[PDB]
Symmetry: C4
Subunit: 23 residues, 4 copies
């Protein structure tokens, strides 16, 4: 499922960027 | 699955909106 | 899949809670 | 799907970390 693939990549990137902004 | 579909859309929108708010 | 189900519910909830916190 | 599983775990962790940060 392409939608699931995109959402997974987006969530992983989202958590990383949020951690980097909090740091 | 409607729940997976809605959650994927919402995660994509959540990343978009969060980034725009941080900018 | 209970993990996917819980993650979908939780992602919806996370967007709700973040929008309300920023507002 | 390992990608979906990793992203689900990541989403649960993200809500946990974000809630702890807001509190
Ligand atoms: C093609 C995709 C390009 C993406 C758009 C690039 C534009 C960035 C503009 C100004 C940044 C200046 C602010 C310096 C960094 C602080 C904001 C921040 O930390 O955000 C990063 C994270 O993705 C969310 O917070
Ligand atoms: C599925 C279950 C969802 C349960 C949802 C829990 C609601 C939070 C409880 C009380 C808010 C306390 C009133 C103070 C208002 C600040 C908002 C707040 O602290 O909520 C936690 C989080 O930071 C986002 O708002
Ligand atoms: C899956 C494992 C995750 C491991 C958990 C690591 C927690 C380490 C926290 C601070 C050390 C670095 C200080 C960084 C300060 C940012 C604080 C932060 O991490 O935000 C979330 C936290 O629960 C509220 O702030
Ligand atoms: N925060 C979101 C919640 C929804 C999912 C992406 C991340 C998550 C992982 C996959 C399987 C379901 C639906 C999406 C794809 C649960
Ligand atoms: Cl935030």
């Amino acid at each position: 499922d392409p939608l699931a693939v995109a959402a997974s990549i987006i969530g992983i990137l989202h958590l990383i960027l949020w951690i980097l902004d909090r740091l």
